[model samples]
Target: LKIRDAYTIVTCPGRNFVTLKIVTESGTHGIGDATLNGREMAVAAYLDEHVVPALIGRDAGRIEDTWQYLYRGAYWRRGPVTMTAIAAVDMALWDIKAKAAGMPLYQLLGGKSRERVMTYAHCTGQTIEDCLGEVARHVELGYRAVRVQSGVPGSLPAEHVWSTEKYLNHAPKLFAAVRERFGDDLHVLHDVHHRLTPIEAARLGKAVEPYHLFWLEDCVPAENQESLRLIREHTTTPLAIGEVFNSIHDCRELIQNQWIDYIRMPLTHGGGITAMRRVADLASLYHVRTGFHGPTDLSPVCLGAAIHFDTWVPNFGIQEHMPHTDETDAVFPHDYRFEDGHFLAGESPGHGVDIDEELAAKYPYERASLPVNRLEDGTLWHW
Candidate 1:
C-alpha cells in the first residue's frame, strides 16, 4: 500500500519528544522518534515542512529506497537535525512494514537472538561511598549490569566542569570499592563522558583494569578518531565510543583497527534502524558489538524500537537503561518492560509503541537545554 499522509507531533511529557507518524491507504499507521534532546523542534519542523511532502504518494514498502532518497537527495547530508528527520521516516516505514507482515519487528529482522535483550542501568552518587549505595539500589532492582557516573569533589564553579586529575585519581578507587563490595560477577561500566585527554584516559583505563570493567565509555572525545590509538596503546580496558556520532563513517577506523570493543550509537541519533544496522553489521566484521546510547533525553518510542533491534541483532553487546518518568510512560503506551536487568520487547506488531496524542497534548512543549561546561582557567570544555 502507498503512504497517504504524514505529519510530526511534538510533546513534552517531562522532556520534549518529536514523533513522525506515517499513515497508509489501508489505515495502518506507524510512529517514529525524531527526538534530538534540546533540539526537538528542528527535527519536527524538518519533517512537517520538508519530509512529509516528499513521502506522500510514495510506496510505503520501499524502505531502503526512501532512506537513500532522503539521505542523498537532500544534498545536505548528515547532521543531527537532518539525520534525526530521516531516522523518523525510516523507523515509521519499518513499523508499517512489520505491521503489514503481521509480525513483530524483530521477527522481520531475524528471530530472537536470545530470550530477551540484556541491559545496563545507570547508578550515580556525589561520592564513592554514596555511589556504591546507588549501585546496591540498582542491584536490588534486578539490574545484572550497572553503569557508574560518580560525582566529583571540586565544587561546581560551573556545571559539567571537572578536574581530570581528581577524576582520574578517584575513578580507580570507586571501581575498586565496587569490586570489594559487590564482587566481579556483576558487569560494571563507567563513562568518562569525554572529559579526559588521551593520556589521562589511558591512565584511568590502566588503573581500573584490576576491577574488570565491562567497558569504559567515551573515554575521550571521538571526533579525532586517531586519538583512540594512543589510548589503545596503553590500556586493555575495552573502549566504547560514539553516542554523539550520527554516521558509521565516524568510527570506521576505530572499528577496523579493533581499537574499540563496543559502538555506542543510538537509533535516534545514528539515523534509525536502517542506518544503524549497517553500522552494527560492519562492527560485527571487526568483532565489535553494539552498546546503544539510552539517556532520559531519548523518548520511550526510541527505546521501544531499540529493544526490537537489540533482540534480533546477532552480535548484541548491551543497551543503556534510564527509566522514564510516569508522565512520559503514560504519554507513550508501550509493551516493553525491564525485568532482571533486561528489556523485553513486546510481541505486538509495528514497533510496539504508541502515543496518547490527547494526553500528550495536555502537556505542551517546554524549552530546556542540557548543561554546558568550561575548564578551570575559563577554557571551554565538552559536557
Candidate 2:
C-alpha cells in the first residue's frame, strides 16, 4: 500500500485535540493524534504542510522505515513539535499495517502480557480537606490509584495559585490527609508538576516516605536527569519522569542507572510503536516499567496506542487516565474500555480509533489559553 493523502483535523472537546489522518493509495486509512497542550497547531502544520508531502506514494506498511526516514530526514533531529508530528505519521502507518494484518495493534508487538492495564487519575484540590475529599471520591468511584495535589497554606491570596514554589509548600498536607483517610490500602502518587528544586524534591520525598507513595513525579524539571540521581539517592520514594521527553537519549541514563522506577513518556512524544518499543526495551535492562502519561490534552488516538503498548510490554507498570469531555469522546470513538479502574484496549484492528471527521468539524479549534502562574510580586512562574 502506498500513501495517497494526509490531512489534519483540529477540534475542541473540553480541550483542543489536533489529529492527523493518512490515507493509503489502496484506500485504507489510519488516524493519529498530534495534540500538544497549548501547541496543537504547530504539530498540525508540520504534518499538513511538510510531512504529508513526503508521505504521498510511500509504502503504507513501512512503519519502521518511514519513522527512521522522518527522524533522519528532518536533519534537525528530535524535539516536542517535530517528533510529535512525525509520531502522528508513524502511528497512522502502523495502524494501516495492523489493519492489513487483521490483528489488533498489540498482537503485532507481542500479545497481551497482562490481564488489564492499571491506570491512575488526577484527584486535585484547593485545600487539604478538599483534596482528601476528591481522593475519597476517586476511591468510591473505583480508582485503585490516584495522584494528589493541593493548594499551599499561608500564602498570600495571589501567591498560592501563582507561586512557583506551591508544590513544595503544600505536598505534605495533601499527602497527610490521604494517609489519614485511606490508611495505606490503595496506591497513592503525587505530582509536584515541576515546581520544586532538587533539595526541595528530596525533602518532600523524604517527608512522604512513611506514607509510601507509588512515585513522585516531576518534582523538578527533568532537563537535567542527574538531578533525579541526587533525589533518588537521598530518598526511597520512587521517581517517575519523562513526560516532556521526545527521544530515547533523553532518558537513557535515567533508565540505565535505575534512577527512576517508571518511564512516563508515551508514544506521542517518543514517536509511535517503532520508537517507543526501543525506549521500553532500554528501560527493561534496569527493570524499569511503563507509566505512560495520558491526559485530556493527548487525543484518543494517542491513548489507544498507549493502551496497546501497555498491554503488550512485559515491563508494564501503570498508566495515567484523565477523562476528556463527552465531546472529545464523540470525536474519536474508540474500542478501548475502562472497567473498574483498569483500561483494556480492544482486540480490534488499526489502533481501535476512528475520527468522525464530520463530528470533529463541529468543534472547531478555539484558542483556549491555559492559565498563567506568577509569584505575588509579579514574578512569573512555570505553568
What are the models' TM-scores? 0.97, 0.95
In candidate 1, what are the lDDT values of residues 1-383, reduced to their tens digit? 89999988888888888889999999999999999987777888888888999999999999999999999998999988988999999999999999999988899998789888888888888888888999999999889999987777771133656577777877888899899999989999998888888998888889988998999999888888998998899999989999989988888999999999999989988899899999999999999999999988888889999999999998899999999999999989999888888899889998899989899899888877777787777678888
Give the Å shift of residue 282 in candidate 2: 0.6
RMSD of each: 1.9, 2.7
Residue 65's lDDT in candidate 1: 97
Q: How many backbone clashes does candidate 1 have?
A: 0
Off by over 4 Å in 1: 155-159
lDDT of 1: 0.89
Clashes per candidate (backbone, < 3 Å): 0, 0
Lowest lDDT sum, 10 consecutive residues, model 2, at 155-164
Model 2's C-alpha root-mean-square deviation from the true structure amounts to: 2.7
lDDT of 2 by residue, 88-184 (tens): 8888888888999999999988988999999997888878787788888888878899998777765112333455455466667677778888887
Would you list the C-alpha lDDT of every candidate in the order shown? Answer: 0.89, 0.85
lDDT of candidate 1 at residue 305, scale 0 to 100: 92
